[PDB]
Amino acid sequence: IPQTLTNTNLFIDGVSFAGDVPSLTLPKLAVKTEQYRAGGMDAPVSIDMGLEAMEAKFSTNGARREALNFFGLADQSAFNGVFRGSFKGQKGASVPVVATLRGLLKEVDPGDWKAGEKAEFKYAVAVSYYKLEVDGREVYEIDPVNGVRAINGVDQLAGMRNDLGL
Amino acid sequence: IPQTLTNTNLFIDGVSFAGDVPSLTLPKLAVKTEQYRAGGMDAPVSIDMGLEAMEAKFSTNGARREALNFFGLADQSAFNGVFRGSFKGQKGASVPVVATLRGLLKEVDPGDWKAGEKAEFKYAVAVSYYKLEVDGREVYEIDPVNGVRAINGVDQLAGMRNDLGL
């Protein structure tokens, strides 16, 4: 049932960037693993050790102001932004995929201005909070400063929250 | 007798992904070796030291839900999934190659959403259990947490199982 992504749009603070954003990138949600090899067994196995540093990145190719004006902002996690993306599907009805991500803008990379090529600024928000929804349905909600890694409702850290006494 | 792979399909939990899975990848079954050079001989030789960390990876290019909803799931080795692949063969009769692999989803990488290119999510299950069959015949069965590396029936760790007293 071919889905595929058709169109994409990017918000920062309500301000639509319907225009300059030729690339989005959601934070690669990865676990920490640590290949556990130990007594009684050959071949490791790997363990949930917590997630990796979620970093998301978009790249407007316009001097956009509304994006540049969050860089190094004293209040880390002030930059909010929402990465919406419509997946078409061969049978018409498009699936809205939307990923709000309160984080810290971190860095800004304007590449080689060449007087004949889309300048293309770049950005890389060090994501703090991150909720990825599909068809208006929570699939992920990863909150580090709180410990709320919750796959579609069920909170996989509800058990460690207690043992830590949070 | 040319074989080659024709078509491929991917299961996660019974749910067929007959649709979005342009790439599968079975876990590269590798041994640990350790090039043994020692007294009385020039040139090493290499020793069975146990296997390497089996990791498998598929990559649906649709916001599929049924796949995303296993990431970082508290219960490592809850993600099951079966990687089926039909090898044609010039003489018609296709050889079913199928590789069930109970493992931990580990990580999910949605690449560059570009508003004009298959978004292509990515996945990388840290495989725990893994049984690869050919023509409905067990070729591999690697189980680390148990020590059951069994090439088509015969269990090559049956001898170390005893010495360890498992």
């Binding site: - | 019974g14 099951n80 148990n146």
Partner: protein, 257 residues
């Protein structure tokens, strides 16, 4: 059923229910004498029934005097504890009945076959309570005409193994049969089964989808079959310490050296 159990009627009810349940029914036979207990045990032979004869004697603080309990309550309680801190597949044979003091009849137990009161009751398929002031239970055996189901360990394993299977294959009891339905289930089984092997519960196993039964007719009518043949942990019982007091190592010491 504490006390209400000497009565053959209640015990029969316990057995029938216990079957319609797959639950070890813990009886307490006639507290008085041993001849009665044995005679009573011969009336049964039902797998599930597991009897405990010596009525425990615990010191009730309230009345400040030795009460007299029916024993079945303490057996069941310790059964639960054994399921937890040891495993549901480990017998409660040698485990300590917490609380309580003596019994209502001193139970003898020694070595060398003999008429050891314990050996007697544990050859009529009855569990007793031995050692100082009701120290512990004694008897993995159960009331069963069938020798295969002689051990409660066997029965309990064979039951609770399946409890774990069903509580896990809940999804498998509905759903449109697909091409891969048979395999989803035969693998799901190999998962739970394997895990049980890992944590000791069993020793090897074998699951597959019995072909000589799986048919178009049965499938159209929803049904389908599988085999789950496995082996259960034999509880070590009757260690035979053979000993010879020789004079071999005599010269090896003493003389000169």
């Amino acid at each position: 059923a504490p006390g209400h159990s000497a009565q053959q009627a209640v015990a029969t009810a316990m057995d029938g229910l216990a079957e319609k349940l797959r639950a070890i029914a813990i009886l307490d036979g006639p507290n008085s004498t041993d001849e009665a207990a044995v005679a009573y045990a011969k009336n049964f032979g039902s797998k599930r029934l597991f009897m405990v004869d010596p009525g425990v004697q615990v010191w009730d603080s309230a009345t400040n005097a030795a009460r007299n309990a029916p024993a079945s309550a303490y057996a069941a309680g310790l059964f639960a504890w054994t399921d937890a801190e040891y495993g549901f597949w480990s017998s409660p044979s040698n485990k300590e009945i917490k609380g309580v003091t003596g019994t209502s009849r001193p139970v003898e137990f020694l070595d060398g076959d003999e008429t050891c009161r314990a050996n007697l009751l544990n050859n009529a398929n009855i569990a007793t309570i031995i050692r100082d002031d009701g120290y512990r239970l004694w008897g993995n055996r159960t009331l069963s005409s069938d020798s295969k189901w002689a051990f409660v360990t066997r029965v309990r394993t064979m039951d609770l193994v399946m409890d774990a299977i069903l509580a896990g294959h809940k999804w498998a009891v509905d759903r449109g049969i697909t091409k891969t339905y048979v395999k989803d289930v035969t693998e799901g089984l190999r998962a739970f089964m394997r895990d049980l092997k890992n944590q000791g519960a069993v020793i090897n196993f074998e699951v597959y989808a019995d072909p000589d039964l799986n048919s178009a007719s049965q499938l159209a009518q929803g049904k389908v079959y599988w085999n789950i043949r496995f082996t259960d942990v034999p509880p070590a019982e009757n260690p035979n310490f053979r000993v010879e007091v020789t004079d071999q190592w005599l010269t090896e010491v003493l003389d000169v050296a």
